[PDB]
Amino acid sequence: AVPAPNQQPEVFCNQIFINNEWHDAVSRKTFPTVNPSTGEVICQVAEGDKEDVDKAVKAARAAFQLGSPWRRMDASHRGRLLNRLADLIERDRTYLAALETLDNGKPYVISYLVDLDMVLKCLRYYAGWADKYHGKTIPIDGDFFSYTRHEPVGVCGQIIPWNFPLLMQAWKLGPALATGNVVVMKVAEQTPLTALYVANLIKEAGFPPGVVNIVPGFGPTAGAAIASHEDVDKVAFTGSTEIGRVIQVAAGSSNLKRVTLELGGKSPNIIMSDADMDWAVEQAHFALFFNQGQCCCAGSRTFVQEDIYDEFVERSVARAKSRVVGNPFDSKTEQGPQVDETQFKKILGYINTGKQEGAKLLCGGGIAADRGYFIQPTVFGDVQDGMTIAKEEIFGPVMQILKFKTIEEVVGRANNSTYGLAAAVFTKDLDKANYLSQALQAGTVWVNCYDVFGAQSPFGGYKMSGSGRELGEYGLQAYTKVKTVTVKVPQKNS
Amino acid sequence: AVPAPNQQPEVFCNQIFINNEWHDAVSRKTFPTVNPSTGEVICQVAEGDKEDVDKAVKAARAAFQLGSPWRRMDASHRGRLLNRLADLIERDRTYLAALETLDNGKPYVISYLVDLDMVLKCLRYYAGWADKYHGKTIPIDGDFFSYTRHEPVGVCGQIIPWNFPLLMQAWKLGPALATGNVVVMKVAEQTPLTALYVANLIKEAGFPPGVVNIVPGFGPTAGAAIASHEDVDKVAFTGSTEIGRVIQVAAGSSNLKRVTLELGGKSPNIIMSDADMDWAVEQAHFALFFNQGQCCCAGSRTFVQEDIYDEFVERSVARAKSRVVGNPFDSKTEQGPQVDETQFKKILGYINTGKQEGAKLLCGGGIAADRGYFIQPTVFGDVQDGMTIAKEEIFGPVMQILKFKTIEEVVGRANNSTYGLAAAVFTKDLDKANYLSQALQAGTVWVNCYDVFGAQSPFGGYKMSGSGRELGEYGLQAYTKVKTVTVKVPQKNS
Amino acid sequence: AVPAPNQQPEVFCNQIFINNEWHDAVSRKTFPTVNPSTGEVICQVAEGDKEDVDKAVKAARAAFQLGSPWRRMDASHRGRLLNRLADLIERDRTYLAALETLDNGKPYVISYLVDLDMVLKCLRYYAGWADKYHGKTIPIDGDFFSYTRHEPVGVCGQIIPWNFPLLMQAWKLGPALATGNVVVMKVAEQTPLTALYVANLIKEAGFPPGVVNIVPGFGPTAGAAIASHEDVDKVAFTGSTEIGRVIQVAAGSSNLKRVTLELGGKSPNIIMSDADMDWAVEQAHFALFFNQGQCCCAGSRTFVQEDIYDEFVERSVARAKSRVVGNPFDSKTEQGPQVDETQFKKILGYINTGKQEGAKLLCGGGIAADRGYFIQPTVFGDVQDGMTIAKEEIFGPVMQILKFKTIEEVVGRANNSTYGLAAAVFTKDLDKANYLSQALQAGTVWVNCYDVFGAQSPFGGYKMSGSGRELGEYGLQAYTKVKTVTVKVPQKNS
Amino acid sequence: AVPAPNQQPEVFCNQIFINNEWHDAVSRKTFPTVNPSTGEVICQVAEGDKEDVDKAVKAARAAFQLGSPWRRMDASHRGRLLNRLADLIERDRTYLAALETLDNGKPYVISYLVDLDMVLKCLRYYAGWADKYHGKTIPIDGDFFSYTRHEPVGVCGQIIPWNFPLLMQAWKLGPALATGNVVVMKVAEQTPLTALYVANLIKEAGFPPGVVNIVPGFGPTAGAAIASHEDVDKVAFTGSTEIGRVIQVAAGSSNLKRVTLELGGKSPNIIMSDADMDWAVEQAHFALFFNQGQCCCAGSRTFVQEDIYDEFVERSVARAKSRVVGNPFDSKTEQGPQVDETQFKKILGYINTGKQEGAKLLCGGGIAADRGYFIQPTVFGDVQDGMTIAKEEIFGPVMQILKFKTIEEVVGRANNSTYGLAAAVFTKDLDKANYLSQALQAGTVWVNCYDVFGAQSPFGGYKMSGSGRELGEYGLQAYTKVKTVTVKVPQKNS
Ligand SMILES: NC(=O)c1ccc[n+]([C@@H]2O[C@H](COP(=O)([O-])OP(=O)(O)OC[C@H]3O[C@@H](n4cnc5c(N)ncnc54)[C@H](O)[C@@H]3O)[C@@H](O)[C@H]2O)c1
Ligand SMILES: Nc1ncnc2c1ncn2[C@@H]1O[C@H](COP(=O)(O)OP(=O)(O)O)[C@@H](O)[C@H]1O
Ligand code: NA
């Protein structure tokens, strides 16, 4: 039930978005954005830098001034605008899905049925929160009346990755806007197109000038300018652990702005012996291969109980070999190309590193096409905890299958990691599922499923996977300041 | 680890408690309270009636007047008082436990380790809620500041049963006092002693006069006087569905006061084929026989899958035969006498009715001693849905074991009842437990356990088992009035 | 900014709505509905009775069966449906507003700008709550995992009055539907039209058959049939205190169903001497006269401090005399006719009762036109607390102005009432506002404003003004059952 | 009602506290702690460093291990322990108050009546939260059961200042312990005594070894070691903005641990023309001079409306001159000495800087005694926003009085600051109070009062005054990790 795509969608937006107007970079420079499926340049995009970020923050701050349309606006109206934006996105669903595929490389079918669906649900869910995040009236001691107001944080800098251009944008705009904040967004240089188009819809939706500003550009330039800005009240980052540290330090060095980090992981997918074989195999495959493996919480560590190891591995390899790689606009395509050349090589490097360390290559392991950044679905057997491919996030179609004996054993092994973004357990036993879900040190533990995100459920990590949460009511906390007002009263009564 | 009990505790309180003072009934009348273990009169107790309830309500209302000590007192101080009450009760724990056994009949060991333990945990749990039940500040449209205050409901009438005199008292006083209400409590004529002694501890703890008033007496007299009183703002009742209807009608006929009912049930205990046999049998036994079967949520309908039916029944019968019946003060005693003669006969009648309808009597079925109201642990096999013993709450040590085939089948049969207080499921399968816990129409669904009450978890029923909840944060809603204050402000900003 | 109305809107729906189908009464009877502005019959409408209510409940019950489309539907989707209904109402906004005026009598402008605007905001508000009313995971003692599910209460009987036909409908449908209940609604015989038209839109919106059933008819027949029905789980009533008692008794006499009552009031509007005179006079006028005085929380007791009494009264009288009474479809019209002849006489009766008691008639006091049920804006001065016009709810354009000296005095006088729905205070002083908003025993206290309802702020009364609340998060509590599931786990850890 | 103090309290604890044991620093070094009233050394205290912090973190990590006594302990029991700690502190109340005064210098009367009272209230408040911080069950789309668990963050490093030794300790221990975290606390070198004694009480209360570890020592050594430790999950700091930046950078450079900062401020105290003169003067005086001005939210910028400026200044100067300075153990002493020599000089420097810049010295301005660090209550009039004493936090008994004309003016001037911890308004006007409380950019806005802290009300700052909040339910968020468990179920139903 998917409409025919325009395999060559036209690009209308490729500049810097500030105050609902399109501007060229102050430097006039532009950078190209590549179609990962062909390696060809799609178009030129304004290259924002420090001076462009400065103009954006200034517009954002002005839109956030006391008495401004955005600040005076009824909370319920913010919800109306979010719902309107959702409607416009649904109107241009087919176009956006195609553009997403063109710039990112993910299958159009998935782009339409998954990405945009979730974008719509995210925006619609948050529209509903706009006028429901209450403060409190507190029964403090003495003759006083005390209450709290949940005010917006202010100017929020949002730096998003390229794996889910639209979804990441929505996960950030949703809570930020619902709570009345203003945004300065820096989209990934590899996939700036869709987000820039949405900025056009944000204008058509009626959001006041300066409430949302998007600055396309490079990380060390535009991104760092945001993180170090003296007038940015908060910076939300989603990407590598490496850059996540840079952000945190730039924040402490500047104005002590709030910082939430959504880093990657080496998510353990534990398959117990009593698990439904058919389901576990299909889900473990999805768990890793989803979105060309370019998933922050990809199940890149598939722990399988010894009794079912051989059979599991056999089925997984068969499924991996049957995974159709090709043109993302083709309906049969299950896996498209990787985002860019840099990731293309980085992943080939990890594949090589895997063979070198003793991991048993069961299938794939090389380039899947001469044109574009396509990689064959790769699976490694008999992986060990000490191996590089079992410690570092590959972010590609490379599966690692480890073997284990006891449930107490797998707990320690799955937990022995610097990451803790997600985890999964497949079993039919009640006690085992409860034991594991509690023992596993991950922000999200799936039972007999994987990658089940609800706009309603919080998503974040433990340890070096980041701090703070996104989605659900918890996503609102990070975009809110608590002000307490305590008033002296004549005589307090219960 | 249980101290030696005074098998003949002295009684210090046996009058009406109003304004922290002991009074005789206006009529001067007194009624006897019996020791169910010997059938002997323990002592005389003031027989409160309408004129006494009138005095109590008057006292309560005065203590609730704006500006009074109780109304002005800091919420955190109410918590202090509840904690103080808990301390006093722990001080006299050994005494109270013995007095409880003397008047109620339950084993002293259970009285000490279970009842009083839960009373202490309940009072201490609620003590902590006293200053944490917040109102809200609401983001209403327009230039207004809107907020809510959670105010006490007022004079609360509390009519409690005899199965757990102390615990029932605590379950009512806890949320009511934490929220700042005043109480006029009517304790069961069969077990007024412990509650009256606690009233003395309430005065010792420092609660202002009139905050808690206890009127011992009969139901149709004192109880009905409370339910129909024009100045009682709320009545919480716990007992038979029969009287529960009288209470609700009395409330609609008077001042439209709030009403919460905690009626009995015919709670289904579903044992799946893959359940841990040893655990299931022990828990199913506990599920019904606990407190001489005098438990509102007793598992009086033990549904067992056909594959394990015969084995289950065998073990259950063995366990029932081994259940020690005798002097409640004896450490070996597992089951004491029933509360009184009326219940004694009522149970014997149901046992008789069971034989006559075709239910297979597997053990017991008659009187267990010539002195006291002791009944043999009875078990009925091959029970059918249409039988009386499978529809009406016996409230005695009489177990009903039914057989079933499919999971879809047992859902419908377990749900086919006018009651819906509790239910339980024993299984090792994840999907089965979740399917059942969701499909079962009961206020509380236990999985692989039974009678697991936390002072922190809500407890109430569906359908004709009552309305409203007790325990947990939900218990507070029933004792709170929501007042909304909407103020016009110069200019609203987020 | 109001579109031209069709002063003679066509009626498309005038039958009983069950299972998304239009049916005639089983009896085949019909009753006429009158246009209060002309006294002429608009059309004939199906006259539902017990038999029709029975059919409605059965349909509702079927739509609520486990596994049904409405029960399985994603919570987010129920919100989608409510938003769709809101869009349909907005589409037909001009028509509905005209039809509301035709049947009820309130000015078209008000119907368009106020009633319909509020209905859209109400449904859109609740659409957002659909997937955000979370249950809890409770940290109970022992090795257990305890949580709560907020389930729909079931089949909800909703009986609504005629003062605000559409808004009352929305206030009931919103929370009920967002929480997944099914409804059997009984609309007022004086104003059944708009609600029946909305049932058509409910069908067009996609709501499953039986989710919403409307049975137009009389109270003693259809209404009583719902209140006494054995299969209705909850009954929500809004109307006279007289009938509210009937409903509560009918509920306790039947199945112990849940009951929430939204009864009237004799709301105090207190004007302190330091209030802004211009604003207080305009607001007090609106507080009472709004909607032909046919408002449950009308400020029918305007208490004015002695120092500004003469001046206030003078301005109030002038404003009352200048209030334009006439054809509700005329833009200049501020006051339309009263709903029907019965109310017309009832008010004439109170006006006379006022004169007889000694209250000073300052203006109006008689019929305002020979056609329709128009009454002159009436104002009584120097009213006393003992007078009947100061104790009973007139529900008409009859203002009562009382004089007072101190703030301690007015508190006692404003509180001395069987009603406690709302109250207001006009003052510039912080301490006075806080003192009174705390002291006043009313479910809603407005400071320097009146009739400020937010779809997000709770609305209900104290004492004999009812139990339970509507609007805001609190409105969801009444349409929800709390199920507690407590699971045994291997070993609990924090 | 204050017991007679031991002006020379014994010191029982002066070492490093790890695993409920007292240890000397690994280096064996010790630093002296001075009595600011006499300048004499009280005693020697173990000088902890990196190696000591290492040992503390290890013990804390061990106590936090899955299956440990602290991890398995009932949430309600954590509350019992906190309540037992409070009891022990109350038992030793007079001793602790004396010790607090000896080491810090604040008046014994204040230490006893204010500090210790608040410590008890804080611990008792949080004891109540131990088992009431619920997770949620979320209505996610699809056939899934999704819920959240609120888990402890882990090993929390807590670095506290010297202005409120005991209170700051309780403010940190309360929420951290209530939520089941383990602590490694670094107390200020100027005031380590009281906290160390409390550690002894923590052992006596029954807290498992390793749950609380206190390491006295210097900042750049022990403090930095905690902030940069690889195994510390969270660091909460309270002190200078200067060090607060060091902490945040140390965290981003290490393990991306969570960071909450409680920095100082230059809190504006606005006195409107209509304020109660007597009350405003007394509160403004309290606002600034309290605790020798060593208060993070000291009202160091007293803005006064021009119409009442002269009278206000006059009264304030009179009140400052009558403030009794002297031996803190004397009942008549209102002001004790400053914490240490460094602060003593820093303050004198600001005083001098004040005179140099043109501020009008109205009283004091010099040393108040030859012995001890006493400074005279100083007041500066006609202060200007540009002046150093109007921008930098003095932290001493030095008041700045500024003049203003309009309410719109004062908001901008009050907001024009790097800080935003607190603020206050004195007015009798409702609209003014609401306008200001909303407009002021501060974490806490007081109306007609100052320094009103409730264990129940959140406390934190805006901008460079820090991030995160303390006290109230909000204090728990910082010490909790949210884990989401999403389980696949057979068929989801509402
Ligand atoms: N606002 C407050 O709550 C508050 C309280 C006390 C002091 N202060 C500020 O502190 C100023 C001067 O006193 P101070 O310098 O001793 O306070 P500070 O902020 O430096 O001291 C607070 C805590 O930080 C620790 N610390 C110091 N340097 C550290 C470092 N490099 N890394 C990690 N931890 C370190 C200290 O040992 C102490 O335990 C005061 O004038 C005021 O500005 C503020
Ligand atoms: N008619 C009544 N009106 C009010 N309360 C009653 C009435 N009858 C009994 N009660 C009270 O209800 C509580 C529980 O008793 P009930 O449910 O009637 O069990 P029983 O009467 O079989 O002992 C006791 O306080 C009892 O006195
Ligand atoms: Na200061």
| Token pair of A481 as six digits | 């300041």
Residue C402 host element (H or E): strand C398-404
Count Cβ neighbours within 10 Å for each residue of A291-306 and write b for 16 or more, e otherwise. bbbbbbbbbbbbbbbe
Which residue among B243, B261, B339 has the greatest number of ligand 2 atoms within 8 angstroms of its CB, and so is best to mutate? B243
Please identify which of the residues B47, B189, B262, B470 carries the catalytic annotation.
Answer: B262
- Which one of A138, A442, A477 has the shortest CB-CB distance to D457? A138
For residues C302 and C275, give the distance between their C-alpha atoms in angstroms, rounded to a whole number: 14
Of C408, C489, C493, which to mutate for an interface test with A (greatest number of A Cβ within 10 Å)? C489
Contact B419, B266 (CB under 8 A): yes
Contact D127, D177 (CB under 8 A): no
For residues B238 and B492, give the distance between their C-alpha atoms in angstroms, rounded to a whole number: 48
Query: Smallest CA–CA separation between C57 and chain B, in Å?
Result: 16
Residue C83 host element (H or E): helix C75-91
Q: How many CB atoms lie within 10 A of CB D321?
A: 13
Ligand 1 atom, smallest distance to D346 CA: 41
Strands (E) located in A80-208: 135-138, 144-152, 155-159, 182-186
Residue with tokens 């009348």: B29
Q: How many CB atoms lie within 10 A of CB C200?
A: 16
For residues C153 and A432, give the distance between their C-alpha atoms in angstroms, rounded to a whole number: 34
* Ranges of CATH 3.40.605.10 domains, chain B: 2-264+455-494
Rounded alpha-carbon distances, angstroms, from residue A224 to A62, A342, B161, D246: 22, 21, 69, 20
Residues in chain A: 494
Residue B23 host element (H or E): strand B21-23
Residue with tokens 């140390």: D250
Rounded CA Rg of chain D: 23
Dihedral sign for Cα atoms in the order A164, A165, A166, A170: positive
For residues C6 and C436, give the distance between their C-alpha atoms in angstroms, rounded to a whole number: 46
| Token pair of B159 as six digits | 């009519």
Q: Is A18 helix (H, G, I), strand (E, B) or coil?
A: strand
Of A74, A76, A82, A445, which to mutate for an interface test with C (greatest number of C Cβ within 10 Å)? A76
Dihedral sign for Cα atoms in the order C81, C82, C83, C86: positive
| Token pair of D37 as six digits | 């009233």
Helices (H) and strands (E) in chain D, counts: 16, 20
Q: Which residue ranges have their beta carbon within 6 Å of ligand 1?
A: D 159-163, 186, 188-189, 218-220, 223-224, 227, 238-240, 243, 246-247, 262-264, 296, 393, 395
Query: Smallest CA–CA separation between A280 and chain B, in Å?
Result: 15
| Token pair of C286 as six digits | 């609106």
Output DSSP code: residue C282.
Answer: H
Under CATH, what is the fold of the domain D265-454?
Aldehyde Dehydrogenase; Chain A, domain 2 (3.40.309)
Resolved by: X-ray
Residue nearest to atom 13 of ligand 1 (CA): D240
For residues D234 and D256, give the distance between their C-alpha atoms in angstroms, rounded to a whole number: 9
Rounded alpha-carbon distances, angstroms, from residue D398 to B287, C104, D105, D355, D383: 70, 69, 17, 12, 12
Please tell me which residue of chain B has the smallest CA distance to C454.
B140
Contact C270, C410 (CB under 8 A): yes
Contact D466, D264 (CB under 8 A): no
Query: Smallest CA–CA separation between D113 and chain B, in Å?
Result: 17
Helices C75-91, C116-129: crossing angle, 10 deg rounding = 170
- State the distance between the two ends of chain D, measured CA to CA, in whole angstroms: 59
User: C253 contacts in B (CB within 8 Å)?
Assistant: 245, 249
Q: Which ligand is nearest to the CA of D344?
A: 1
One-letter amino acid identity for B153? Answer: V
Contact D402, D417 (CB under 8 A): no
Output DSSP code: residue A389.
Answer: G
Pairing between β-strand C422-426 and β-strand C444-447 as defined by DSSP bridges: parallel
Contact C57, C225 (CB under 8 A): no
Q: Is D342 helix (H, G, I), strand (E, B) or coil?
A: helix
Output DSSP code: residue C5.
Answer: P
Binding residues of C for NAD(+): 239-244
Active-site residue, D296 included: yes
Bridge partners (DSSP) listed for residue A408: none
Count Cβ neighbours within 10 Å for each residue of A175-207 and write b for 16 or more, e otherwise. bbbbbbbbbbbbbbbbbbbbbbbbbbbbbebeb
Contact D161, D236 (CB under 8 A): no
Chain C contact residues (CB < 8 Å to D) = 66-67, 70-76, 131-139, 141-142, 147-149, 151-152, 180, 427-431, 433, 447-448, 491-494
Rounded alpha-carbon distances, angstroms, from residue D467 to A146, A465, D443: 21, 21, 10
Which stretches of B37-104 are DSSP H helices? 50-63, 69-72, 75-91, 93-104
Q: Is B73 helix (H, G, I), strand (E, B) or coil?
A: coil
* Ranges of CATH 3.40.309.10 domains, chain A: 265-454
Rounded alpha-carbon distances, angstroms, from residue A27 to A41, A193, A236: 21, 20, 26
Residue C423 host element (H or E): strand C422-426
Output DSSP code: residue C357.
Answer: H
Residue nearest to atom 9 of ligand 2 (CA): B219
For residues C410 and D300, give the distance between their C-alpha atoms in angstroms, rounded to a whole number: 42
Residue D16 has phi, psi (to 5 degrees) of -90, 135
One-letter amino acid identity for C407? Answer: I
Ligand 1 atom, smallest distance to D421 CA: 1
Size of interface B-C (CB pairs under 8 A): 188
For residues C180 and C75, give the distance between their C-alpha atoms in angstroms, rounded to a whole number: 8
Contact A362, A319 (CB under 8 A): no
Please tell me which residue of chain B has the smallest CA distance to D129.
B128
User: A480 contacts in D (CB within 8 Å)?
Assistant: none
Dihedral sign for Cα atoms in the order A138, A142, A143, A144: negative
Q: Is A241 annotated as a binding residue?
A: yes
Cβ–Cβ below 8 Å for B473 and D134: yes
Residue C392 has phi, psi (to 5 degrees) of -100, 145
Residues in chain B: 494
Output DSSP code: residue B67.
Answer: T
User: Among residues D241, D235, D286, which one has the least CA distance to residue D259?
Assistant: D235
Residue nearest to atom 25 of ligand 2 (CA): B188
One-letter amino acid identity for B147? Answer: Y
Torsion region of C13: left, alpha or beta (phi above 0 gives left; psi -120 to 50 gives alpha): beta
| Token pair of B227 as six digits | 């339910």
CA of D92 to the centre of ligand 1 (A): 28
Bridge partners (DSSP) listed for residue C23: C16
Contact B385, B416 (CB under 8 A): yes
Residue D186 host element (H or E): strand D182-186
Residue with tokens 């003016």: D409
Q: Which residues are within 8 A (CB) of B127 and not within 5 positions of it... i.e. 6 or more apart?
A: B79, B80, B81, B82, B83, B86, B178, D128
- State the distance between the two ends of chain A, measured CA to CA, in whole angstroms: 59
One-letter amino acid identity for B288? Answer: L
Residue nearest to atom 7 of ligand 1 (CA): D239
For residues A12 and B451, give the distance between their C-alpha atoms in angstroms, rounded to a whole number: 65
For residues D265 and D423, give the distance between their C-alpha atoms in angstroms, rounded to a whole number: 10
Output DSSP code: residue A113.
Answer: I
For residues B411 and D490, give the distance between their C-alpha atoms in angstroms, rounded to a whole number: 14
Cβ–Cβ below 8 Å for B139 and A428: no
For residues C287 and A418, give the distance between their C-alpha atoms in angstroms, rounded to a whole number: 63
User: Among residues A231, A260, A259, which one has the least CA distance to residue A65?
Assistant: A231
Rounded alpha-carbon distances, angstroms, from residue B110 to B100, B328, B433: 10, 9, 30
Contact A456, A125 (CB under 8 A): yes
Catalytic residues of A: 262, 296
For residues A301 and A400, give the distance between their C-alpha atoms in angstroms, rounded to a whole number: 5
Please identify which of the residues B122, B295, B296, B363 carries the catalytic annotation.
Answer: B296
For residues B55 and B61, give the distance between their C-alpha atoms in angstroms, rounded to a whole number: 10
One-letter amino acid identity for A362? Answer: L
For residues C33 and B73, give the distance between their C-alpha atoms in angstroms, rounded to a whole number: 56
Helices D165-178, D116-129: crossing angle, 10 deg rounding = 10
What's CA D155's distance to the chain center, in Å? 20
Contact C160, C222 (CB under 8 A): no
Dihedral sign for Cα atoms in the order B450, B455, B457, B462: positive
Binding residues of D: 239-244
CA dihedral in degrees (A277, A281, A282, A283; nearest 10)? Answer: 100
Contact D296, D330 (CB under 8 A): no
For residues B270 and B449, give the distance between their C-alpha atoms in angstroms, rounded to a whole number: 11
Q: Which ligand is nearest to the CA of B227?
A: 2
Contact C182, C211 (CB under 8 A): yes
Rounded alpha-carbon distances, angstroms, from residue B213 to B22, B48, B56, B193: 10, 12, 6, 14
Rounded alpha-carbon distances, angstroms, from residue A440 to A432, A488, B210, C430, D22: 12, 48, 53, 54, 35
Q: Which residues are within 8 A (CB) of C455 and not within 5 positions of it... i.e. 6 or more apart?
A: A76, B141, C118, C121, C122, C124, C125, C126, C174, C471, C472
For residues D155 and D56, give the distance between their C-alpha atoms in angstroms, rounded to a whole number: 10
Residue with tokens 């820096």: A186
Residue with tokens 């948050």: A126
**How many CA atoms, within 13 angstroms, populate the side-chain half-sphere of residue B223?**
19
Cβ–Cβ below 8 Å for D83 and B83: yes
For residues A113 and C460, give the distance between their C-alpha atoms in angstroms, rounded to a whole number: 44
One-letter amino acid identity for D455? Answer: A
Ligand 2 atom, smallest distance to B244 CA: 17
For residues C203 and C192, give the distance between their C-alpha atoms in angstroms, rounded to a whole number: 17
Q: Which residues are within 8 A (CB) of C411 and not within 5 positions of it... i.e. 6 or more apart?
A: C436, C439, C440
Strands (E) located in C306-377: 360-363
CATH number of the domain located at residue range(s) D2-264+455-494 in this protein: 3.40.605.10
For residues A379 and A360, give the distance between their C-alpha atoms in angstroms, rounded to a whole number: 8
Query: Smallest CA–CA separation between D223 and chain B, in Å?
Result: 34
Helix/strand/coil (H/E/C) assignment for every residue in B427-455: CCEHHHHHHHHHHCCCCEEEECCCCCCCC
Size of interface B-D (CB pairs under 8 A): 69
| Token pair of C432 as six digits | 């006075």
Q: Which residue ranges have their beta carbon within 6 Å of ligand 2?
A: B 159-161, 186, 188-189, 218-220, 223-224, 227, 239-240, 243, 246-247
Contact A182, A154 (CB under 8 A): yes
Q: Is B401 annotated as a binding residue?
A: no
For residues D190 and A163, give the distance between their C-alpha atoms in angstroms, rounded to a whole number: 52
Q: Is A11 helix (H, G, I), strand (E, B) or coil?
A: coil
CA of D161 to the centre of ligand 1 (A): 6
Residue C236 host element (H or E): strand C234-239
Residue with tokens 């486990």: C66
Torsion region of B448: left, alpha or beta (phi above 0 gives left; psi -120 to 50 gives alpha): left
Pairing between β-strand A234-239 and β-strand A155-159 as defined by DSSP bridges: parallel
For residues B396 and B376, give the distance between their C-alpha atoms in angstroms, rounded to a whole number: 10
Contact D388, D394 (CB under 8 A): no
